Design a protein around this ligand. Structure first.
Ligand SMILES: *C(=O)[C@@H](/N=C/N1CCCCCC1)[C@H]1N[C@@H](C(=O)O)C(C)(C)S1
Length: 498
């Protein structure tokens, strides 16, 4: 008979158990049943429902009490089964996901993959987050009764629980998403969607009452806003668009344009600054998040050569984060618009896209990826949750297969685009100077406002040689605190405690 394997555990960067296995003890003529009532406190309910496990769950007391009366009950034995436990619950609901009961649907799927024998004795399966993406590595090989089951591999995530909780705290009541990342590794220090729910509700098996709650909730907690949230990336895109315009030579380090707070299609487009920024280079256009300047560059570069370059930053593309719940959003093209809407591409479509607006939609993870790329001077990093896997009691570390590069690393285009962001935070004309008031570290940021308007901030530090990057969005503005406020708080927590 099949011996179910113990599911591999999930841990934060510092080995803090995030997903655990709790032992549930089970007991397994109608005279015998009444005889057990005093020995295990078998209730009128446990016999009614029992109509195979006679009593569940047993308490170590009731077990120990049956254990000494084992001889007085023939064949009846105590069985130690396991249930997934999520200590930190709602904190990780999205990134860790959860295991839930296998239904006849999950069966059919296992059947055609030819692994149904492995799940013979297994009741729960990874249905979300790391639990789903790594279900394979977390399940283990099944054993037989005596050929022992090979226990599922432990997964060490790059997550920092301390930070992950701290973010959830800061996003309270705000439909929001945050993706802290170590840009040196691609490692996701934190991945937070608000609102969340208890992952533990699913382990036993979720009530259609409880699910229709999460399903029909206005705030839509079920959605991982970090990876499945499609938002206009708005001004966050400008630094990458900047680098793309430089590489394409459609602008240069110093390319003065005059902003009157307006830009018409040579049909006007209002800059955020009602009476404009005046004489603008990219460095200043980024610093002050000037629309006019980028409205122009959009037109000069044109949809096809802009779309192409953003596709290199991974917009419209799956980031390759180790999660099965992900959207690619859309980096729009003529090709796309024609197919999709069955109308050709107008120039009034290229202008919105120039300020990460229009048809352009992005996932916080996409935004987090594109920033890491900009930080590493075009050496693309895949956002990864997995830090290492326990393979034969050895931690085997994550190793990136994607060696991708874009343009020349030695091109001083990254340095200027980044310097702009250095300005957005440190210099007095900067959009986010208010938020990085007196940072012991030197932070670089690019704020953004989409379409109540979404409020966005990508940011990284210490600029001098960065070890953190953040992509935060607060759907329809912050519940209360500013996106810039929270970005400060997050960079504080990591860089002051480092
Ligand atoms: C970037 O996305 C930029 N443009 C956004 N909008 C155009 C002007 C009307 C306001 C909303 C749409 C915004 N970037 C933000 C920011 O917070 O950085 C501003 C305020 C500079 S405008």
């Amino acid at each position: 008979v099949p011996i179910a394997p113990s599911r591999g555990m999930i841990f934060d960067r510092n080995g803090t158990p995030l997903a655990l296995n709790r032992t549930i003890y089970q007991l397994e003529l109608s005279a015998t049943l009444n005889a057990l009532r005093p020995i295990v406190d078998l209730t009128d309910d446990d016999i009614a429902n029992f109509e195979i496990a006679v009593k569940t769950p047993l308490t170590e007391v009731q077990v120990a009490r049956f254990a000494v009366n084992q001889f007085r009950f023939p064949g009846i034995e105590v069985k130690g089964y396991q249930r997934r436990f999520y200590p930190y619950g709602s904190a990780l609901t999205h990134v860790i996901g959860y295991v839930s009961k296998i239904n006849d649907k999950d069966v059919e799927r296992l059947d055609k993959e030819g692994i149904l024998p492995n799940y013979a004795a297994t009741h729960d399966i990874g249905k979300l987050g790391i639990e789903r993406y790594y279900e394979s590595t977390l399940h283990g090989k099944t054993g037989y009764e005596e050929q022992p089951p090979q226990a599922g591999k432990d997964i060490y995530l790059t997550l920092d629980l301390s930070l992950q909780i701290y973010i959830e705290k800061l996003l309270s009541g705000s439909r929001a998403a945050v993706v802290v990342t170590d840009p040196r590794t691609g490692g996701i220090l934190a991945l937070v969607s608000n609102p969340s729910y208890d992952p533990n509700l699913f382990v036993d098996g979720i009530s259609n009452k409880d699910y229709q709650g999460l399903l029909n909730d206005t705030n839509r907690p079920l959605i991982n806003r970090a990876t499945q949230g499609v938002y206009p990336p708005a001004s966050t895109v400008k630094p990458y668009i900047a680098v793309s315009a430089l590489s394409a030579g459609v602008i240069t380090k110093n390319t003065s344009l005059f902003d009157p707070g307006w830009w018409q299609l040579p049909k006007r487009y209002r800059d955020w600054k009602k009476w404009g920024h005046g004489r603008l280079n990219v460095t200043k256009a980024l610093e002050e998040s000037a629309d006019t300047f980028f409205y122009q560059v959009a037109y000069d570069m044109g949809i096809d050569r802009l779309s192409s370059w953003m596709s290199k930053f991974g917009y419209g593309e799956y980031t390759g984060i180790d999660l099965s719940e992900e959207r690619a959003g859309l980096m729009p093209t003529r090709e796309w618009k024609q197919k999709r809407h069955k109308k050709p591409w107008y120039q009034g479509d290229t202008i919105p896209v120039g300020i990460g607006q229009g048809y352009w939609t992005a996932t916080p993870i996409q935004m987090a990826k594109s920033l890491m790329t900009l930080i590493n001077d075009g050496t693309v990093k895949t956002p990864h949750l997995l830090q290492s896997t326990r393979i034969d009691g050895v931690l085997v570390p994550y190793k990136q297969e994607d060696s991708t590069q874009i343009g020349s690393i030695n091109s001083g285009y990254w340095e200027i685009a980044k310097d702009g962001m250095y300005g957005v935070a440190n210099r007095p004309n900067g959009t986010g100077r208010k938020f990085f008031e007196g940072t012991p570290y030197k932070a670089a940021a690019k704020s953004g406002t989409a379409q109540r308007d979404h409020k966005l901030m990508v940011a990284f530090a210490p600029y001098e040689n960065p070890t953190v990057s953040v992509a935060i969005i607060l759907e329809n503005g912050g519940a209360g605190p500013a996106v810039g406020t929270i970005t400060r708080q997050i960079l504080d927590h990591i860089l002051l405690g480092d």
